[PDB]
Each structure stands twice: as C-alpha cells, then as structure tokens.
Copies of this chain bind each other. A is one copy, B any other.
Amino acid sequence: SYSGYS
C-alpha cells in the first residue's frame, strides 16, 4: 500500500 502524499 501507499500512505501519504504523492
């Protein structure tokens, strides 16, 4: 998964 800001 990805968590945060892209």
Interface size on A, residues (CB 8 A): 6
Smallest CB–CB gap between A1 and chain B, Å?
5
Indicate how many identical chains form the complex: 10
Distance of A6 Cα from B6 Cα, bound (Å): 5
Interfacial residues of chain A within 1-6, with CB under 8 A of chain B in the complex: 1-6
Add 13 more A-B contacts to A1-B2, A3-B3 (CB < 8 A): A1-B1, A1-B3, A1-B5, A2-B2, A2-B3, A2-B4, A3-B4, A3-B5, A4-B4, A4-B5, A5-B5, A5-B6, A6-B6
Distance of A4 Cα from B4 Cα, bound (Å): 4
Distance of A2 Cα from B1 Cα, bound (Å): 6
